Design a protein around this motif. Sequence first.
Motif, PDB file in Angstrom:
ATOM      1  N   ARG E  21       4.291 -17.447  17.168  1.00 15.84           N
ATOM      2  CA  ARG E  21       4.678 -16.100  17.575  1.00 15.84           C
ATOM      3  C   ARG E  21       5.981 -16.120  18.359  1.00 15.84           C
ATOM      4  NH1 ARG E  21       3.841 -15.004  14.514  1.00 15.84           N
ATOM      5  NH2 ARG E  21       2.212 -13.995  13.266  1.00 15.84           N
ATOM      6  N   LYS E  22       6.147 -17.107  19.242  1.00 16.62           N
ATOM      7  CA  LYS E  22       7.395 -17.233  19.987  1.00 16.62           C
ATOM      8  C   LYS E  22       8.571 -17.490  19.056  1.00 16.62           C
ATOM      9  CE  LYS E  22       5.267 -18.994  24.226  1.00 16.62           C
ATOM     10  NZ  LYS E  22       5.107 -20.178  25.114  1.00 16.62           N
ATOM     11  N   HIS E  23       8.390 -18.374  18.074  1.00 14.76           N
ATOM     12  CA  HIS E  23       9.485 -18.736  17.184  1.00 14.76           C
ATOM     13  C   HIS E  23       9.761 -17.667  16.136  1.00 14.76           C
ATOM     14  CE1 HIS E  23       9.795 -23.245  18.151  1.00 14.76           C
ATOM     15  NE2 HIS E  23       9.002 -22.702  19.056  1.00 14.76           N
ATOM     16  N   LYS E  24       8.753 -16.871  15.771  1.00 11.13           N
ATOM     17  CA  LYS E  24       8.941 -15.882  14.714  1.00 11.13           C
ATOM     18  C   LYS E  24       9.919 -14.795  15.136  1.00 11.13           C
ATOM     19  CE  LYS E  24       6.267 -14.176  10.941  1.00 11.13           C
ATOM     20  NZ  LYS E  24       4.892 -14.211  10.371  1.00 11.13           N
ATOM     21  N   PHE E  25       9.703 -14.199  16.309  1.00  8.32           N
ATOM     22  CA  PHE E  25      10.567 -13.110  16.748  1.00  8.32           C
ATOM     23  C   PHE E  25      11.966 -13.602  17.088  1.00  8.32           C
ATOM     24  CE2 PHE E  25       6.429 -11.019  18.085  1.00  8.32           C
ATOM     25  CZ  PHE E  25       6.404 -10.205  16.973  1.00  8.32           C
TER      26      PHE E  25
END
Lengths: 104, 57, 55, 91, 221, 99
Positions: E21-25
Motif C-alpha cells: 500500500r505504501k509503494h502503490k500510491f
Amino acid sequence: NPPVLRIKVFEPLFIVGKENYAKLDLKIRVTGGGQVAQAYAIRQAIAKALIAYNQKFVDETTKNELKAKFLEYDRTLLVADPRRCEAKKFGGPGARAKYQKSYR
Amino acid sequence: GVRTKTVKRAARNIIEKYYPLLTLDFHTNKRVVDEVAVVETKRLRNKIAGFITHLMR
Amino acid sequence: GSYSIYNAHPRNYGNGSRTCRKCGARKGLIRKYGLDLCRRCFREKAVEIGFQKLD
Amino acid sequence: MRIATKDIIAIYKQLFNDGCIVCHKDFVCLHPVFGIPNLQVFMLMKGLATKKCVKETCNWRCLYWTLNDEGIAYLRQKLALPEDAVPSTLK
Amino acid sequence: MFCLTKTKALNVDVLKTNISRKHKFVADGVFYAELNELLQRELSADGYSGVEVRKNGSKFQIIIRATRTTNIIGDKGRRIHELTNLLIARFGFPKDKIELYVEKVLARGLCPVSQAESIKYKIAEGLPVRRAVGSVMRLIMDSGAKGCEVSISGKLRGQRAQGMVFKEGYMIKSGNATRQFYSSAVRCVLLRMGIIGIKVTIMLDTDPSGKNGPAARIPDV
Amino acid sequence: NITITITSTKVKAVESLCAEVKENGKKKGVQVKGPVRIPTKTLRITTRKTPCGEGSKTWDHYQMRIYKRVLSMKTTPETVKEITSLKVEPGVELEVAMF
RNA sequence: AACACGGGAAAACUUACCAAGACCGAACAGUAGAAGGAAUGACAGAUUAAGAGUUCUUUCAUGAUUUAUUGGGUAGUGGUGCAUGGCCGUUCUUAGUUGGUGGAGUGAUUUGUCAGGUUAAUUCCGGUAACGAACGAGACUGAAACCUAUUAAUUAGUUUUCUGCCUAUAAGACAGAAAACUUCUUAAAGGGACACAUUUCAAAAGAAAAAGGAAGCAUUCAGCAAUAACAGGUCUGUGAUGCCCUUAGACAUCUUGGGCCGCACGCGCGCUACAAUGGAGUUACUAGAGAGUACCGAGAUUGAAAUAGUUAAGGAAAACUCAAAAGAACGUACAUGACAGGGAUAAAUGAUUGGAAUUAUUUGUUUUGAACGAGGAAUUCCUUGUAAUAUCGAGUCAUUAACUCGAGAUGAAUACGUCC
C-alpha cells in the motif's frame, strides 16, 4: 516491580480508608509508557474507580465527599497530566537545544 | 489579546443590523452568528461572538 | 574486438548502477518507497506526486 | 554504427509497424525488446533523426522517436515494402 | 560484439499486482509526474495544459485537457494513436486496458501553463517583453482571475541579468489559501543570448471553493 | 462472506465511498457492516532544501497519508458489488476480496 | 551566512586525479574503392597486467552494417555562479512595504504610514490633509491537550460459554475453541475557550491574579510567510543553459592498478572516559515511531564458546517479522589503590559481504593495559515533559555509523527580569 513507588500507588487507598475498597475488587491492565509513568497511571485508575463506582451505585453526596477528599490532597489523582514529548527539530539534538556554532 | 479589525468590524456590523437578536450570553450569540452570518471557521465565530457580548455589555 | 571490452565491469552492487529517474544522478538517491528520484529532483515533483509540505 | 544487418531490419520493421520505439540512456544495459545494447539502437535512430525522419524528444533519460512522412518514405525505400504500405495512424 | 549482461525493463510499477500500500500510491505519483512531463514535451505546440489518470477498474483512461485542440480537432486518429503507441513502448502497456481522451478547457485564461506558453511564444517570436506580458495579463484578468503575477528573469536589458515582476489584481502570499487558490507554472525559453525564466501564478476564485479565511459577508434582513 | 477494502490519499473521498456502498447495500445486499477504520499510514521524507551544501542546514518535511477502510458484506458471489466501479474517483482504489 | 557541509559513512563503479592500454560514443553530405569483397570478427605462437586479434605470423569465418577522405556536427563531473534560468541561504523572526485620488514643495521628496496609550504585531483605542484600499501580522494548515455524548469492530480490546490442565480455601491462572460487546484502541463527523465572567489596575483598546476546565503565554510546537536586495552557493543534479576550451595521439568513452584514508604539525563538529550518584556477575522488566518480497523483512528447529552455518513458517503487512535500556532487585563480591575505573595501541587465530578485503570492510576468541585524577586563555546551547542522561527506528546500506532525521524512557536547578 519498582518497589520504592508502591506506597505512592497505595496512597489512594489510605487517602479515604481501605474500607472504601474492602467490598471492591479491581483488575487493572497497564500497557504503555515506562515504569514510573505506569505508577501514576495506576494511581489515577484506582482513585477514579472509587469515584465512578460511588457515582453509579451510591448517592451523590458520598461521591462528592470522596472526590473532594481526593482533590484537597492532589488534583492529578482524578485528572490526567497533559504534558507530552515535544517533536525534535532539525539543527539540534533535541526539542530546543542546538548544535554548537563555530566562528573561526 | 487585542482583536484584529476583521473581528471588530464584523462585530460592529452585526450589532447594528441584528441588535434585537443578540443577548448578553456568549453561548446564544454563537448560534445566532452562524445564522445571521456565514463563516467557514469556528474560531472566527467565537471571536466575533466573544466581542459582541463584551460590546453589548 | 573493438567493443568486447566496452562496459565489461560488473555493476551489480550499486553506486554506479543506481541512478536518478529523470536527473540521472548518482548522488543523493532517495530509494525509500521505491521512489528512486534522487535529491534536487524529488523536491520539484513532490507536490505532483502527493507528498504535501506538512510537518 | 557496426551492427548486425539482420538486427537493423528488426528496428526498422518494428518502428514502421508501430510508429514509435523508445530506449533508455543507460548504455551499460541491453534493450529488453531487441535484446541488444542500447547504444546500437540509439545510434541507428539518431542518424535517422538527421534525415528529418523522426523527432528525438528526450524525457527522464528515456528517448522517444516518432515516424514522420519522410520516415514512411525512407523506410519503404530501404526495407522495400509494397507501395500500398501507407497505412498511417495504425502502423 | 557486446558482453553486456544487464537490462533495463520498460515497465511501470503501477502495473504490478502484488505491491505494498505504501509503494502503490508512491508509484502512482511517480507515473503521473513522468507521464505529465512526457506529453508536456510532445504537446508543446498543442498546449496540453494538464493531465488526468483516472481508471475504470482494469483499464486506464489518460485524459489530456488541451486548451487548443486545433492539431487534434479531427486528426483522424494519428496523434491519439501515436501517443497511445508511445505509452505502449515506454511502459509496456497491454493494449486492451489503455485509451486516451482529449478534452478542452473553456477557461483558457485561468490555465497558468497555457498562459506561460503564450509568453514563451511571443518572446521567441521577437515581441518586446513588456508587450508580451501586458497582452497575456489582459486575457487572464477578464477571464475571471482574482489576480495574477508574471515574473521574468534573464538577460533582457543586456549582459547584466535583470528580473521584473508584473502585478495585477488581488493575491494572497501567506497562508493555506495559497494551496487552494493558487495555480502556477514555470517555463524557460532560450534565445541567441541566454535563458529567460518565466513564472506565471494566477490566483483563482471560488471555483476551487473554500472562501478564504478573512470573510464575513453578513446577510441583511 | 465478502470483504471490501478501500485505500486512498484523500480522507474525504473514502468517507463518500464508504457511505455509497452502505447506501447501495439496501438492495442486492442484506447488511452493511460499519466501516472499520484501519490506522492511517504516514510516509515521511525529510530532505535538505539546497541543491548544494551552502547555507544554513535547513530541511523540509513531506508526508503522504494513506487512509484504509474495511467493509464486510454477505451478498452472493455472483452478485457481489455488481457494477463495483461507479466511475470511481482518481486516486481511490477499491478491491473486493472474498474467501 | 565555509570546516559529520556538497544529503560526500569514496576497496572496483561512484571519480571529476594519477600510470598505462586500447577506443569512436567521427551523425549528415560529396569523392575513392567496392557485393568478383568496403570492411569486421577470429584458434595458436610471440608482444601485452590482461581470456584488448592491440600488434608481428597464419589463413578461417561474416558481409555495404562503412573504411580513408573534406565541409560539419556531437560529446565532456572542462572554464566561466563576475553571462543566465531554477532552487536555496542571508539581510530577518521583526513588523514591515506600496499606489489611486486629494494636500505641501520649483525639486529630489513628503502626508496618508501619526500626539498619547496598548499589543507578540502600523494589533487596536484614539488622533487627523487626508479618504479609500492592497500585501505582510492575524485569520489559515498539521500535531498535542478532551468527549463513559454519536457512528463504527478487523487485522484492537474486554466479557460470556464449552472442552482441557493446575494451585489454592477459595478465587482464579493458562491452552484451544466459539459468540455478544465498545470504557481502553483505532478514526470519522460534530461539540469544546472567545479571555466571557468575577476582583483589581489602566471613558476605551487592554493588563495582572484567583476560581472553573482536558486545555487560560495567541494554549504549546511547527508549516506557509510581504517589498527590495547580495553581482551570497550550485553551470560537478538536470538532454535547464549563453560564450569560451578540447574534439581520433581527445579534457569524449572503455579496461586494469593506485589515490581521494597518504603525516612534522594547526583548527572545527563529535564519541568514550577520568569512577563508589561506580564498574563487574545474575534476575524481573517497561515504550513510541519506524520498515519489509520475484527475491525484502525473517518466525520456529538444530549445529556451538562466540561471530556466523545447514534446513526452514507466516508476511505486500493494526494480521507475520520487530525485540528497549537508563533505572530496579539478589550477595559477609569489589573498597579507594591508574585497582576489577579507561579500553587506545599492538599479537596469534574464527568467520561474514564481495569478482576482488593487503593500506587491517565488519566482527568473535585469548593476550597486550598507554594517555586520562574533572581540564589554561577563551567560548557554545538552553526557560518545562524543556536541558541533561542512556537507548530504539529510519536515511545512506552487496558490507560499513562515533553522522543526520525522527521516537519514546527518567525528569533538575534557576528568572518571570534588564538593555550592561
